[PDB]
C-alpha cells in the first residue's frame, strides 16, 4: 500500500530520532527531508526509493 | 484639414489616433469608475525618427461660454509650471476648440484605478504603464504569478520604479495648489485631470475669487491616491541627501529619535493643502478617528527614518544607588513618540509590581546581550541573549499501531477508495523556527485610503453595538486555563498560574492602572508547535508576557465574554456547533436575502501580512466600549501598550531578539476577535468599492443610485459622521450581504442579482481590496460559491455541511474531512500514548466529530463512525444516554434539546 | 509561598544582567543625548563587546566576514571563534568553496570589538 | 526504544519490498553501507563487505547489485587503504579482509 509505507516511514524516523541522529545537523536535515517527501508522495515507487535511502541511515550505524 | 491645423498651432509633427477611469461627483452620478470617452481627439507626437513617443495632443470642442471661461482661468494659471500648456483656437467645420499639449496616454486616475481595482488577465493598462515608464520589460509579464506579492516579491521593485513619478506628481500638485490660492481660484482637484508627468489641464469647474483667497479641495485626490504612495514607495528620495536618488543616504544621528520636525516638514512638502490637523505624536490627538487619521500619515513618513530609531526609548535609572537601564517611552512608526508619565529617576526599594515591569521589558535584556547580525532573515535583529544559537527541531509523531491494525482489519485504507491517510506530524529540522519567522517579510508598511477607512470604521462599529464592555476589576477576572505560557522572562519560573497566585488583587489593579499612564513593552517567545497537519509547513505558538495578557484580560474580558455569549449575531465566536447550533447559525445567515447565493473567501498569509493600520483600527473598535470607564489619555495609553506588546513587539526566537514588523500574535486571546473586526472591515470596504466603482447611470434602482450618491459624499465630501447614513448603509448590508464571521473565516449570503449588477461585493472586489490594502493576491481557487442553499456553505471552520432528516424536519449538520478524523486517530501525541484514559477521551472526541458522517450518502464515509465506535468499545472492554460506548450518546450531541 | 521564590528569581536575574553591562561606554553613549534618552536598538549596536554573526552559506560568508577582521556597524571586529550548527569549532582554513559541503551550515562567528 | 526498533522491523518485513529486503538481508550478513544510499544516477556509495561468500553473492564482474539497482565499481579500498584490483580478488587471495567498495549508479 501507500499508508503502510508512510506509517513505516514515520516509525523509522522515530527510531532514528531516538538514536540521537538530530545531534548531527547535516544528518538530521537529510532524514527530515526524506521523511517529509515520503509523507507527501502520491505513487509507491518514489516513496519506496526514499524509504531505501532513509533505511540506509539506520543501517549505517550499529543498530 | 483638421490635422495640419492642430500642428499648425503647435510646431510638432503629429499622428492621429475607449474606457478611462474618472472621479465623478455630479448632481446625477457619483463614483470612481471606468466611464466611456466620446468627445476628444488624440494626436501622437514623434521623435527624431518616425517612432511614436508618450506625448499626446488632446483636442476637444466646447461651446463659446466655457471656451471663454477656460481661457480666462488658464491665463491666470499659465505661469505655474505644473500646468499643461493649452492652445485655444477656432476651426470652421466656427467651433471653438481647446488643445492640451504633450499629455501622456494615461492620467493619474488610470494608475490609481489600475492598482485599486486589480484583476489578473484584465490588466492591460497597468502593464502598459509599467512598460511605458521603464519599470519592467514586456517579457517580464510572461513569468507566471508576476503580480503576486507572495510568490514574486520582485514586483515590489517593479512598482517601486514608479515611485519617482508619483513624488513629482505630488510636488506639482502642491505647486498648482499654491498657484490656485495666489490667483484666487476655487476648485476641486481630481486625479483624472492630472497626467503621469504631473501636469494639470482641465479648468472647466473652477471659479474665481479675489486673489490670495483661493481654496483648492483635495480630499478626494489625496485620499484616493494614498495606497499608491506606499505601494510605489514614493518618498524613497527623502532618505537621500537633498532628496536626490543619485546622492548618498542621509547619515542620521544614531542617538536621534524624535523626528517631529522632519515629519512636519514632510507633511508641509507633500500635503500642504490637506485641511485636517496632523499631529505627528498621536498622544496629542482628540479622539480615535483623529488617531486613525494621524497614524495613517505616520506610516508613510516612518519609511523615511532609520529603523534603529523605533522601539523602546531607554534611560539610565538609579535604583538604590545602582545604575539601571529601563524603558521610559516608545517611538512608534504609527503613533510617534510616547513618553511615560510615572518615571522615577531615583528609587530606594524595588516593589514586586515594579520588579515585574523591570523584568518584562527588553531594555535590561538587550543592554546586556551581544550584538547580533543574523543573515538568515531580513528582519531587524536586536541582540543575542546567549553565546549560542538554539536550533530546535520537531520530532515525528507517535504511530498508533493498535488502531491502525484494527482499521485495516475492518476494511479501511484500500487503494482507490475515498478515505486515505493525508494528515501527519511533519518533522522539522534545525532551521525551521527562523525560516518561519522570515515570513514576516510579507508585512509591508501600508497607507490606507483615510476617508474610506474613517467611514468603514463607523459601519464596522455598527456590527459591535449589541455587545457590552468596559473595564473590570482584578477580582472579576475569570482565567480559563492557568497553564498557559507566561512569555519570555517569566517562563523560566513557572506558568501563568504562578503569577496569578503571587500577585494580589491590589497588585494586579495597580499594574493595570500603571498601563493607563505608561507603556510597558514586552517580549514574545516563539516556539515550534508539535501538531498534526496536512501540509509541510511548520506551526508556531507565541507566548505573550504575563504583564500583557493580565492587563489585556482586565481591559477586554467583559466585551470578549459578551461576544462569546451572544447568539444570532454576525460574529459567531463562542457559538457551539452542537445541540443544533450549526442549524441555528446557518438559518441566521440566510436571514431574508432574496436571490441568495453563498460565498466564502480566504485571506492569504493573514497572520503575517495584516497591515498595522487595520490592527490599530481593530483595537480602537474594541476600545470603543470604554467611554465611561476610561478617559481619552487612558485609552491612548492602552492602545500604545497593545501596539508595543502584540503588534511591534520584540520576539525571542531561538535565543535571540528580533523586531516584529507587525501582524497578529497567535497566543494572544484577543487575536480571534481582532481578526473578526478585520474581516468585517475588509468585507465592508469591498462592498464600498463595489458600490462606488459601478456606473451609476446604468443603475436602474433609484434607491441604490441615491445610496451610492450619498456614499461618495459621506466618504470624500463630509468630514463629520452622518449617523443617519451609517445606519442606512448598515441596514442595506444586513439586507443584501448577510455575513457569518469567525476570526478571518467567513460565509456570506448575498443577493446574487445585486452582485451581477455590481451593487454588492463579489470575489473580484475582495481580490482587489486584498491587493491594494493587504499586499497579497487572493486566488479564486481557495474561494467558493454555492448557488444551491439546500447544500450548505462548502467549508466553514474546516467543516462540511449536509442537510439530513432528524425527527420530522431537515437539519443542517456539520461533518469534517474523514481523512482528517482517521489521521488524528492513527497519529497521536506523546502525552496521549502514556495514559490510556486520555486515549479514550481522544477517541470519544473523534467519534463526536465523526458522528454526522453516518448520514452521508457515501457508505465509506459512514463507516468511519462505526470504526471509531467499535474501537471505543474495545478500549472500554480492555478497561441511559450518558454512556459513551453507545450511538445514542453521539446522537444526543446534534439534537436541539440541549 | 511562590511570591518569595519568584521575587528572588526575578531579583537575582535583574542583578545578573545589571552586572554584565559595561558602565563606561554606556554612560558615554547616554550622555551625548540631550534629554538622556536613547533608542534601545542602538545600545548593543554601539556598546556591545561581542558580535555574533549567523551565516547560512559560503556566499554570505565571503561577503560578510572575510579574513580575520571585518567591519560591521562602523566598528572593526577581529574574529575570536567560528562554530557550526553542531557546536563544534570550525577553523578559518576550513571555510572555503571546496570544503563548504562538508560544513554543517549555519556557522556562528563570534567576534570581539577592536 | 527496543520495542519501537522491534515494531519497525515487523512492519518493514510486512511491506515486502525487493530493495528493502535486499538491504536488510545483506546487512544481516555484515554487509552494511557507510553513507546514505543515493537516489540520483552516478553518485557515491561506500559499502563494507566482511565475508568472501558475501562478496560472491553480491559482486560478479565489474558491477554488483545493491538495493535492486546496478552499481559498477570505481575502485575497492581494503583495510590497507590502497587500491585492490578487480582480478586481484580470488578465493586464495581471501586469506591474503573487510574492505569497502565505492560505486556509481547505472
Ligand atoms: C485531524 C486534524 C487535521 C488538521 C488539524 C489542523 O489543525 N488544521 C489547522 C488548524 C489551524 C491552522 S492555523 O495555525 O493557520 O490557525 C492550520 C495552519 C496550517 S498551515 O499555515 O501550516 O498551511 C495547516 C493546518 S492543517 O488543516 O492541520 O493542514 C492548520 C487538526 C486536526 N486535529 C483534529 O481534528 C482533532 C484531534 C483531536 C481531537 C479532536 N476532537 C479533533
Ligand atoms: C466555542 C467557544 C466557547 C467559549 C469561548 C470563550 O469565551 N473563550 C475565551 C473568552 C475570553 C478569554 S479572555 O481571558 O482573553 O477575555 C479567553 C482566554 C483564554 S486563555 O488566554 O486563558 O487561553 C481562552 C479562552 S477559550 O475560547 O475558552 O479557549 C477565552 C470560546 C469558544 N471558541 C470558539 O467558538 C472558536 C474560536 C476560534 C475558532 C473556532 N473554530 C471556534
Ligand atoms: Zn491627530
Ligand atoms: Zn476602560
Query: Quick one: B171 and B300 in the same domain?
Result: no
> How far is ligand 4, taken at its centre, from the CA of residue B315, in Å?
29
Q: Is B292 within the bounds of a domain?
A: yes
User: Around Cβ B65, how many Cβ atoms within 10 Å?
Assistant: 9
Q: Does A23 touch chain D (CB under 8 A)?
A: no
Name the fold adopted by C27-113.
Alpha-Beta Plaits (3.30.70)
> How far is ligand 3, taken at its centre, from the CA of residue B720, in Å?
15
Resolution in units of Å: 2.6
Separation between Cα atoms, residue D102 and residue D106, nearest integer Å: 13
Among candidate residues B226, B254, B269, the one where a domain is terminated: B226
> How far is ligand 4, taken at its centre, from the CA of residue B513, in Å?
10
* Annotation says B139 is catalytic: no
Protein residue closest via CA to atom 10 of ligand 1: B533
Nearest residue to C42 (alpha-carbon basis) of B345, B645, B311: B311
For residue B573, the ligand 2 atom closest to its alpha carbon is 35
B413, B424, B430 ranked by CB distance to A28: nearest: B430
Q: Is the CB of B533 under 6 A from ligand 1?
A: yes
Contact C49 B370 (CB under 8 A): yes
The DSSP line for B341-399 is: S---SEES---HHHHHHHHHSTHHHHHSSEEEEESS-SSPEEEESSSS-----BPPPEE
Place of cell 459591535: B464
Which helix (H) or strand (E) covers residue B651, if one does?
strand B650-652
Neighbors of chain B with 3 or more C-beta pairs under 8 Å: A, C
Among candidate residues B777, B797, B817, the one where a domain is terminated: B797
Separation between Cα atoms, residue B540 and residue B660, nearest integer Å: 15
Domain span at residue A55 reads 1-63
What is the 8-class DSSP label of residue B277?
Answer: P
Q: Is the CB of B577 under 6 A from ligand 1?
A: no
Superfamily grouping for domain D21-105 = Nsp8 replicase, head domain (3.30.70.3540)
Separation between Cα atoms, residue B126 and residue B135, nearest integer Å: 11
C2, C14, C52 ranked by CB distance to B502: nearest: C2
Tell me the angle at which helices B352-360 and B505-514 cross, rounded to the nearest 10 degrees. Answer: 50
Separation between Cα atoms, residue B333 and residue B637, nearest integer Å: 15
Protein residue closest via CA to atom 29 of ligand 2: B480
Protein residue closest via CA to atom 21 of ligand 2: B669
Separation between Cα atoms, residue B70 and residue B60, nearest integer Å: 12
- Cell readout for B571 is 460574529
Pocket test for ligand 1, best of B394, B422, B539 (most atoms within 8 A of CB): B539
Separation between Cα atoms, residue D94 and residue B73, nearest integer Å: 108
Protein residue closest via CA to atom 35 of ligand 2: B574
Calculate the CA B169 to chain-centre distance.
Answer: 27
Separation between Cα atoms, residue B500 and residue B179, nearest integer Å: 65
Separation between Cα atoms, residue B589 and residue B568, nearest integer Å: 9
Separation between Cα atoms, residue B296 and residue B450, nearest integer Å: 7
Separation between Cα atoms, residue B351 and residue A9, nearest integer Å: 55
Contact C26 B325 (CB under 8 A): yes
Kindly provide the residue ranges of all beta strands, DSSP E only, lying in B433-534, ordered along the sequence.
Answer: 523-529
Separation between Cα atoms, residue B603 and residue B152, nearest integer Å: 17
Annotated binding site of B for Mn(2+): 193, 202
Query: Quick one: B747 and B836 in the same domain?
Result: no
Separation between Cα atoms, residue A11 and residue D103, nearest integer Å: 30
* Domain total of chain B: 5
Of how many residues is chain D composed? 106
Contact B350 C11 (CB under 8 A): yes
Residue B819 burial by Cβ neighbours in a 10 Å radius (0-12, 13-18, 19+): middle
Nearest residue to D36 (alpha-carbon basis) of A51, A18, C88, A38: A51
Which helix (H) or strand (E) covers residue B408, if one does?
helix B401-409
Q: Does A51 touch chain D (CB under 8 A)?
A: yes
Separation between Cα atoms, residue B506 and residue B514, nearest integer Å: 12
Domain span at residue B114 reads 3-226
Give yes or no for a contact between B668 and B619, defined as CB atoms under 8 angstroms apart. Answer: no
Contacts of A5 in chain D (CB under 8 A): 15
Which helix (H) or strand (E) covers residue B732, if one does?
helix B723-736
B398, B428, B827 ranked by CB distance to A32: nearest: B428
Angle made by CA atoms B26, B31, B32, in degrees to the nearest 5: 125
> How far is ligand 3, taken at its centre, from the CA of residue D96, in Å?
93
Q: Is the CB of B492 under 6 A from ligand 1?
A: no
- Cell readout for D68 is 535492486
Separation between Cα atoms, residue B374 and residue C108, nearest integer Å: 9
In DSSP terms, B314 is beta-bridged to: B327, C38
Give yes or no for a contact between B551 and B512, defined as CB atoms under 8 angstroms apart. Answer: yes
What is the 8-class DSSP label of residue B799?
Answer: B
Chains B–C, number of C-beta pairs less than 8 Å apart: 169
Separation between Cα atoms, residue C44 and residue B644, nearest integer Å: 20
Contact B397 A35 (CB under 8 A): no
Q: What is the dihedral of CA C61, C65, C68, C73, to 10 degrees?
A: -170
Pocket test for ligand 1, best of B573, B602, B666, B820 (most atoms within 8 A of CB): B820
Kindly provide the residue ranges of all beta strands, DSSP E only, lying in B86-220, ordered along the sequence.
Answer: 86-91, 95-103, 185-188, 207-208, 216-217
Nearest residue to B364 (alpha-carbon basis) of B350, B377, B380: B350
- Cell readout for B615 is 490592527
Q: Does A10 touch chain B (CB under 8 A)?
A: yes
Q: Is B312 within the bounds of a domain?
A: no
CA atoms within 13 A on the CB side of B345: 4
Query: Quick one: B242 and B353 in the same domain?
Result: no
Give yes or no for a contact between B725 and B710, defined as CB atoms under 8 angstroms apart. Answer: yes
Q: Is B415 within the bounds of a domain?
A: no
Query: Quick one: B731 and B844 in the same domain?
Result: no
Contacts of B365 in chain C (CB under 8 A): 17
Q: How do the domains of chain D map onto residue ranges?
A: 21-105
Place of cell 561577503: C63
Place of cell 577582521: C69
Angle made by CA atoms D59, D62, D65, in degrees to the nearest 5: 40
Find the catalytic residue in B192, B219, B449, B744: B744
Q: Kindly list the protein residues that place their beta carbon closer than 5 angstroms to ligand 4, a single-atom ion.
A: B 471, 626, 629-630
Contacts of B658 in chain C (CB under 8 A): none
Residue B378 burial by Cβ neighbours in a 10 Å radius (0-12, 13-18, 19+): exposed
Pocket test for ligand 2, best of B553, B564, B575, B816 (most atoms within 8 A of CB): B564
Q: Check contact A-B (3+ Cβ pairs < 8 Å).
A: yes
Q: Is B338 within the bounds of a domain?
A: no
Which residues, other chains included, contact B83 with Cβ-Cβ below 8 Å and sequence gap of 6+?
A: B74, B77, B176, B179, B199, B200, B201
Buried b (16+ CB within 10 A) or exposed e, C39-63: bbbbbbbbbbebbbbbbbebebbee
Separation between Cα atoms, residue B732 and residue A51, nearest integer Å: 60
- Cell readout for B800 is 462540511
Nearest residue to B461 (alpha-carbon basis) of B844, B206, B278, B727: B727
Q: Which residue stretches of B31-88 are H helix?
A: 64-77
Give yes or no for a contact between B332 and B648, defined as CB atoms under 8 angstroms apart. Answer: yes
- Cell readout for B1 is 484639414
Distances (CA, A) of B498 to B486, B546, C1, C110, D89: 9, 10, 10, 37, 72
Window 462-501 of B, Cβ < 8 Å to C: 489, 492-494, 498-499, 501
* Protein residues whose CB sits closer than 6 Å to any atom of ligand 2: B 479-481, 484, 553, 556-557, 560-561, 564, 573-574, 576, 669, 672, 742-743, 797
Which helix (H) or strand (E) covers residue D76, if one does?
strand D69-77
* Domain total of chain A: 1
- Cell readout for B169 is 506628481
Distances (CA, A) of B252 to B119, B807, C40, D84: 41, 75, 16, 69
Separation between Cα atoms, residue D55 and residue B557, nearest integer Å: 74
Annotated binding site of B for Zn(2+): 279, 285, 290, 294, 471, 626, 629-630
Interface test with A, best of C83, C85, C103, C108 (most A CBs within 10 A): C85
Calculate the CA B635 to chain-centre distance.
Answer: 22
Furthest CA-CA distance within chain C = 60
Residue B322 sits at φ, ψ, to 5 deg, of: -110, 130
Separation between Cα atoms, residue B687 and residue B678, nearest integer Å: 14
- Cell readout for B515 is 498601563
Which method resolved this structure?
cryo-EM
* Annotation says B743 is catalytic: yes
> How far is ligand 2, taken at its centre, from the CA of residue B888, in Å?
28
Contacts of A4 in chain B (CB under 8 A): 413
For chain C, list residues whose CB is within 8 angstroms of any CB belonging to chain A: 84-86, 104-105
What's the per-residue H, E or C state across B451-487? Answer: HHHHHHHHHHHHHHCCCCCCCCCHHHCCCCCCCCCCC
Q: Is B318 within the bounds of a domain?
A: no
Amino acid at each position: 500500500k501507500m499508508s503502510d509505507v508512510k506509517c513505516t516511514s514515520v516509525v523509522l524516523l522515530s527510531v532514528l530520532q531516538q538514536l540521537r541522529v538530530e545531534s548531527s545537523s547535516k544528518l538530521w536535515a537529510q532524514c527530515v527531508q526524506l521523511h517529509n517527501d515520503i509523507l507527501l508522495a502520491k505513487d509507491t515507487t518514489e516513496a519506496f526509493e526514499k524509504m531505501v535511502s532513509l533505511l540506509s541511515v539506520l543501517l549505517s550505524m550499529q543498530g | 484639414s483638421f490635422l495640419n491645423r492642430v500642428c499648425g498651432v503647435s510646431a510638432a509633427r503629429l499622428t492621429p489616433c475607449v474606457y478611462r477611469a474618472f472621479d465623478i461627483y455630479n448632481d446625477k452620478v457619483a463614483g470612481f469608475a471606468k466611464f466611456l470617452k466620446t468627445n476628444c481627439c488624440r494626436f501622437q507626437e514623434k521623435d527624431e525618427d518616425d517612432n511614436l513617443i508618450d506625448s499626446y495632443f488632446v483636442v476637444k470642442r466646447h461651446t463659446f461660454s466655457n471656451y471663454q471661461h477656460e481661457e480666462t482661468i488658464y491665463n491666470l494659471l499659465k505661469d505655474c509650471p505644473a500646468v499643461a500648456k493649452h492652445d485655444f483656437f477656432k476651426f470652421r467645420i466656427m467651433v471653438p476648440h481647446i488643445s492640451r499639449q504633450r499629455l501622456t496616454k494615461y492620467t493619474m486616475a488610470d494608475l490609481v484605478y489600475a492598482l485599486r481595482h486589480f484583476d489578473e488577465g484584465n490588466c492591460d493598462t497597468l502593464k502598459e504603464i509599467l512598460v511605458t515608464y521603464n519599470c519592467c520589460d514586456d517579457d517580464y509579464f510572461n513569468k507566471k504569478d508576476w503580480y503576486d506579492f507572495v510568490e514574486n516579491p520582485d514586483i515590489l521593485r517593479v512598482y517601486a520604479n514608479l515611485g519617482e513619478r508619483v513624488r513629482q506628481a505630488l510636488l506639482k500638485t502642491v505647486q498648482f495648489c499654491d498657484a490656485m490660492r495666489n490667483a484666487g481660484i476655487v476648485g476641486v482637484l481630481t486625479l483624472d485631470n492630472q497626467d503621469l508627468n504631473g501636469n494639470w489641464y482641465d479648468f472647466g469647474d473652477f471659479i474665481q475669487t479675489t486673489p490670495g483667497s483661493g481654496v483648492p479641495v483635495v480630499d478626494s485626490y489625496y485620499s484616493l491616491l494614498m495606497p499608491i504612495l506606499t505601494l510605489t514607495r514614493a518618498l524613497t528620495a527623502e532618505s537621500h541627501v537633498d532628496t536626490d536618488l543619485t546622492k548618498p543616504y542621509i547619515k542620521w544621528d544614531l542617538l536621534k529619535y524624535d523626528f517631529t520636525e522632519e515629519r512636519l516638514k514632510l507633511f508641509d512638502r507633500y500635503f500642504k493643502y490637506w485641511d485636517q490637523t496632523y499631529h505627528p505624536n498621536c498622544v496629542n490627538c482628540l479622539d480615535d478617528r483623529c488617531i486613525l487619521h494621524c497614524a495613517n500619515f505616520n506610516v508613510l513618513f516612518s519609511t523615511v527614518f532609520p529603523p534603529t530609531s523605533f522601539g523602546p526609548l531607554v534611560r539610565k535609572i538609579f535604583v538604590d544607588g545602582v545604575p539601571f537601564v529601563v524603558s521610559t517611552g516608545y517611538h512608534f512608526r504609527e503613533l510617534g513618540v510616547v513618553h511615560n508619565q510615572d518615571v522615577n529617576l531615583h528609587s530606594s526599594r524595588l516593589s514586586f509590581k515594579e520588579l515585574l515591569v523591570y523584568a518584562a521589558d527588553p531594555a535590561m535584556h538587550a543592554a546586556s546581550g551581544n550584538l547580533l547580525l543574523d543573515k538568515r532573515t531580513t528582519c531587524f535583529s536586536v541582540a543575542a541573549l546567549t553565546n549560542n544559537v538554539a536550533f530546535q527541531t520537531v520530532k515525528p509523531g507517535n504511530f498508533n499501531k493498535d488502531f491502525y491494525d484494527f482499521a485495516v482489519s475492518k476494511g479501511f485504507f484500500k487503494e482507490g477508495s475515498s478515505v486515505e491517510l493525508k494528515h501527519f506530524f511533519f518533522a522539522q529540522d534545525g532551521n525551521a523556527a527562523i525560516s518561519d519567522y522570515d515570513y514576516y517579510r510579507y508585512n509591508l508598511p501600508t497607507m490606507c485610503d483615510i476617508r474610506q477607512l474613517l467611514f468603514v470604521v463607523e459601519v464596522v462599529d455598527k456590527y459591535f453595538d449589541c455587545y457590552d464592555g468596559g473595564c473590570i476589576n482584578a477580582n472579576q477576572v475569570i482565567v480559563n486555563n492557568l497553564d498557559k505560557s507566561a512569555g519570555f522572562p517569566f517562563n523560566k519560573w513557572g506558568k501563568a498560574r504562578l503569577y496569578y497566585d503571587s500577585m494580589s488583587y491590589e497588585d494586579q489593579d495597580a499594574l493595570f492602572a500603571y498601563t493607563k499612564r505608561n507603556v510597558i513593552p514586552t517580549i514574545t517567545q516563539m516556539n515550534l508547535k508539535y501538531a498534526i497537519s496536512a501540509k509541510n509547513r511548520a506551526r508556531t505558538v507565541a507566548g505573550v508576557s504575563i504583564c500583557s495578557t493580565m492587563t489585556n484580560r482586565q481591559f477586554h474580558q467583559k466585551l470578549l465574554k459578551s461576544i462569546a455569549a451572544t447568539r444570532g449575531a454576525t460574529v459567531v465566536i463562542g457559538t457551539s456547533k452542537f445541540y443544533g447550533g450549526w442549524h441555528n447559525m446557518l438559518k441566521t445567515v440566510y436571514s431574508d436575502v432574496e436571490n441568495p447565493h453563498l460565498m466564502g473567501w480566504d485571506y492569504p498569509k493573514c497572520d503575517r501580512a495584516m497591515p498595522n493600520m487595520l490592527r490599530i483600527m481593530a483595537s480602537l473598535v474594541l476600545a470603543r466600549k470604554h467611554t465611561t470607564c476610561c478617559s481619552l489619555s487612558h485609552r491612548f495609553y492602552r492602545l500604545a501598550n497593545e501596539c508595543a506588546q502584540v503588534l511591534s513587539e520584540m520576539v525571542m526566537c531561538g535565543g535571540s531578539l528580533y523586531v516584529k514588523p507587525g501582524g497578529t500574535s497567535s497566543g494572544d486571546a484577543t487575536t480571534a476577535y481582532a481578526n473578526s473586526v478585520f474581516n468585517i472591515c475588509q468585507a465592508v470596504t469591498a462592498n464600498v468599492n463595489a458600490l462606488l466603482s459601478t456606473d451609476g447611470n446604468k443603475i436602474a434602482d433609484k434607491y441604490v443610485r441615491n445610496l451610492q450618491h450619498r456614499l461618495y459624499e459621506c466618504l470624500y465630501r463630509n468630514r463629520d459622521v452622518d449617523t443617519d447614513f451609517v445606519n442606512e448603509f448598515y441596514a442595506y448590508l444586513r439586507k443584501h450581504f448577510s455575513m457569518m464571521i469567525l476570526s478571518d473565516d467567513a460565509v456570506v449570503c448575498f443577493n446574487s442579482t445585486y452582485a451581477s449588477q455590481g451593487l454588492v461585493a463579489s470575489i473580484k472586489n475582495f481580490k482587489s481590496v486584498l491587493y491594494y490594502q493587504n499586499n497579497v493576491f487572493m486566488s479564486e481557487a481557495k474561494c467558493w460559491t454555492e448557488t444551491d442553499l439546500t447544500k450548505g456553505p462548502h467549508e466553514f471552520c474546516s467543516q462540511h455541511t449536509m442537510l439530513v432528516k432528524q425527527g420530522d424536519d431537515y437539519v443542517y449538520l456539520p461533518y469534517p474531512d474523514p481523512s482528517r478524523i482517521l489521521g488524528a486517530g492513527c497519529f497521536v501525541d506523546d502525552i496521549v500514548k502514556t495514559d490510556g484514559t486520555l486515549m479514550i477521551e481522544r477517541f470519544v472526541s473523534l467519534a463526536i466529530d465523526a458522528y454526522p458522517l453516518t448520514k452521508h450518502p457515501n457508505q465509506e464515509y459512514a463507516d468511519v463512525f462505526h470504526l471509531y465506535l467499535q474501537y471505543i468499545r474495545k478500549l472500554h472492554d480492555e478497561l441511559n444516554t450518558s454512556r459513551y460506548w453507545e450511538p445514542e450518546f453521539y446522537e444526543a450531541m446534534y439534537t436541539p434539546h440541549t | 509561598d511562590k511570591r518569595a521564590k519568584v521575587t528572588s528569581a526575578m531579583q537575582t536575574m535583574l542583578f545578573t544582567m545589571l552586572r554584565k553591562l559595561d558602565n563606561d561606554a554606556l554612560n558615554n553613549i547616554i550622555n551625548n543625548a540631550r534629554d538622556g534618552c536613547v533608542p534601545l536598538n542602538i545600545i548593543p549596536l554601539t556598546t556591545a563587546a561581542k558580535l555574533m554573526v549567523v551565516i547560512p552559506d559560503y556566499n554570505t560568508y565571503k561577503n560578510t566576514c572575510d579574513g580575520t577582521t571585518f567591519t560591521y556597524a562602523s566598528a572593526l571586529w577581529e574574529i575570536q571563534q567560528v562554530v557550526d550548527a553542531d557546536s563544534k569549532i570550525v577553523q578559518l582554513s576550513e571555510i572555503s568553496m571546496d570544503n563548504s559541503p562538508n560544513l554543517a551550515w549555519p556557522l556562528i562567528v563570534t567576534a570581539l570589538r577592536a
